[PDB]
């Protein structure tokens, strides 16, 4: 019943963002031809629709089962992973040198989009493995790549990111897991990691943990953390799973959602590990993995909006309840389908505006990934790296926050039926809630965007995007079809720079102003990004209608969604502006001991 | 670990809303003296803290267990209900004539506030029974009151509201459950009701169902529905539970939350029932029950904000993570408590502003209930009835919507730990989600407020409240302590009438405009109500500080919370204004068949 949104994915990639010319321009991509790409997307869609989407409810109902022996995944999960590996999917967007198919990361990301929608909990197993692959590719030695990266690329082994300890998630500088150097050049790793997604499971031949730990007499805090490869089974002479390493799962968590993804307490009992990247540069190297996880979680945010929408539109066309305010629209039936109600249309259009808008932002970001990986033009590469660094926190926090809202609109359309397990809409909400907590909380994303990406680059990262918006407004300010979008967009674009300058000035007078403005500044930024993408989709829709498309309704719907976004969602920016400019004192003046005097 | 917010309840009731003079002015209340009332609140708080709050997690973990025989409640629920009945709580705010203690409904509501916070699922059992009591009091014959109302007032029997069928929740005019008249003046009731809260359980001696059904050859729709008393056990000659009636629970639902409250499919197999109220006036009579449920669900919204806050403040003071932007505040510790972070303070102050603000609105509404029930002044009674009709949909939808937001802020403060079952914060979110769906969805509340309460009274219901706000602004516009609140409040108060006039004009041109504006109009109205209550609490805090209170910190915190509300939450009104004035066409123009063309 999940259906992949292939027509919209093709609209965004090929029509909006010129993917054919993009792939034509990039080393290694010249063979990623439209017919090959469309066949790969279609095969991806079928796997998602036929194999893993039917396992989504099973994953939530059964969850994972711990024994000291290991962790059992839900019925069908491991069989589906066997089919995924047999179909070659893990190798799709990885280097030919390491057993990969060599296709662009942005094509892999489209498969990931559909996987995350069909079964997010299932998709975490291969998804975390992609982060581990990216880390080994960027920082691994030749031998670490020959041993571990080839096995991850085939899908035979999976990978995990091991950061969190009981006392620290955001504050990695406090981690205490220790790496004791051995004469043989290896390390013995001792410590307890918690909330390790896919830490233990029954789906693969080995698990490759990528682990943050401290060398003896390393500096205090983040300047003292190093990165280690700690496999569940140590490689044998033939490079296959060998001696059991001293890594074991103590327990799995009982959670609100993503039950199908084992959330593991992992005990490292002087486990053998291998240093990856330079000593004391573990944070820098682990950021390869963390940035993969942030873009992947943004895709999770998109997934919850998409699933919300799919459920909501089906129910709104089928469920009859009350009558239209302008007279019975189905007078032959006992009641009208509830899509006749304006408030139901508001909730449908909200989910649609966020799913379709975020899809545009995601594939825009995916083009930057391809440029950084493949371009020979140092200037093009620098610009793409700056744009990706800017969009990563916006995509993660904004898409997750509005994806949870969208999941909740999906429930709301079902009325009381939305609270019932059988329909899947409440699971979509429960699975969505972790998306704003893991991979860097919304607040951490917001500090990254405003502190590190915007204020610490003198706004150069922001200027990259506002230049695009400015050029779009200059080009479209007298275009009759979209001049209604350009006027507010140009006002917003000017305001975005002015706000940034006002927030920066406040931060110079009081550093608390960075945290005080951060989440409003990020949400404002995401709304502004989608104003640009909606205005551009409206521009493209009007062009296609003028050209005499045979898909008139598809493009007319884009113009309706764009107008709904600008008139009913974008005005949320007015509240983020007022809040962010209101100043840190209204947050910081209350004494800690005075917050709870009503008892 | 739940603590009743007794100091704040006393602040709102006695200091803000003059409850002592209120009770002094009302027939029957003159004995509800401050010392008696405070002892009752304290005993209420202890029951909640000691007996039912420790059962909240048990209720969620075990849920209810169906057998054809009946429905088992979670461990301890029925024992706690035995203690509640032995303590006399069910009879507290009911008529002496029917075995009641005769205390004001608004004092009962304070017990209900603490019950809903300690264990909402448990509280539903006595809470629905109060709705059944109110219905029997208003519409029952002497004999129906002697038989059923006395047993509900003692707590020996519980009560339910049976409306919903598989094909209809909001559209009661489509219900098909039939009542066949018998020669003995009784009716045989045949039909399946779904989502019957407390439909079957093991906690009481009988269950009194209040059931909507259709007489043979009644008019189409709501003009054809009648109300019936259908007990699980028919009364014997001594009025005690007698012959088993043909009422049985076919199944219970599997839901996202409120697991401790049995959500029952109830089969009426030509069950014996008794007409209550006039034939064909079932909707009018059932509204007594439905309005009790709407105010009770508003109290649920308050409960989720309160529990969110209690969990969040405890964690924010205890959890150490990262350091203040203005330098380590706890340099002796490995990290600062996370309350040093502005973004954590924003989430704490949001929950506090909604809990404390909604508490003020709730007890303001509770005074109207007391005036309608007890006043001999017809003019005072009319004004109170109008004010209660206006506030009921605002309280239900606004307090539930912002209570769910507040529950989610509670989770967010815990980071990844917030998703884990052991901490209770995720249960608070899951239990909160039903609050916007049952007792009339947010959208139904919004149509009731804008269509029935405001536009169909020519705004007289709104004018009742905006007159209070106007007089407050005239009184406080030069009061140095709160003039900063009055200026924006007076602008908002003028805007509230202007918006109402603009929305009414649009509705006259196109009736779709009522649904299109409805939810934004309700949320705007709730924010405006809390602007008034926060400005008034700030006024009262400044008065207490000028008087030389020994509780300086309590009142200083009220002023901080009020300023946080005005500067960071109230600007949400700017987005509701823009959206509501944007017009129905941006919702209604998209064709039904064009919403999902991206597949
Ligand atoms: C393609 C998709 C495929 C799909 C497939 C994906 C699916 C996959 C989904 C599964 C999802 C599960 C994911 C669960 C969650 C975890 O796996 S655990 C991850 C959760 N925790 C985190 O994200 C990190 C914790 N919190 C933070 O980020 C903190 O802000 C920090 C960064 C650790 C604070 O450290 P700090 O030392 O104060 O930081 P700071 O001084 O600002 O920077 C230190 C260095 O870090 C680096 N750095 C800092 N910020 C950044 C940044 N934004 N970027 C890069 N480097 C940075 C730099 O090297 C920097 O050095 P400088 O350049 O400043 O000299
Ligand atoms: C104190 C607290 C203690 C604590 C202890 C509580 C804890 C307790 C929590 C448990 C919580 C579980 C609760 C689950 C939920 C369900 O038990 S099932 C209830 C869910 N469904 C509903 O709420 C009702 C369904 N939806 C509606 O409200 C629809 O809008 C309607 C009213 C049925 C539409 O019917 P309609 O015939 O189109 O309505 P309309 O022509 O506007 O009005 C018809 C008549 O109804 C009456 N009426 C309409 N609106 C109203 C109103 N707002 N007010 C009064 N009468 C009205 C009037 O008699 C009216 O006649 P007119 O005065 O107009 O001539």
Author numbering:
A (entry chain B), B (entry chain B): 3 to 601
Paper excerpt:
The FadE1 enzyme has a broad substrate specificity, being able to use both long- and medium-chain acyl-CoA substrates, whereas FadE2 exclusively uses medium-chain fatty acyl-CoAs.
We therefore wondered whether we might improve substrate binding by preventing catalytic turnover. Similar to FadE5Ms, we noted that in the presence of bound C16-CoA, the side chain of Phe289 in FadE1E441A formed a π-π stacking interaction with the adenine ring on the CoA moiety of the substrate. However, by comparing the substrate-bound FadE1E441A structure with that of apo-FadE2 (with no substrate bound) the analogous residues (Tyr440 and Tyr441, respectively) adopt an exclusively “open” configuration. In the structure of FadE5Ms, the tunnel that accommodates the acyl moiety is blocked mid-way along by the side chain of Met134; an obstruction that becomes displaced to allow long-chain fatty acyl-CoAs to bind. This is not the case in FadE1E441A, where the analogous residue is alanine, making this unplugging mechanism unlikely. To investigate this further, we superimposed the structures of C16-CoA-bound FadE1E441A and apo-FadE2 to compare their substrate-binding cavities.
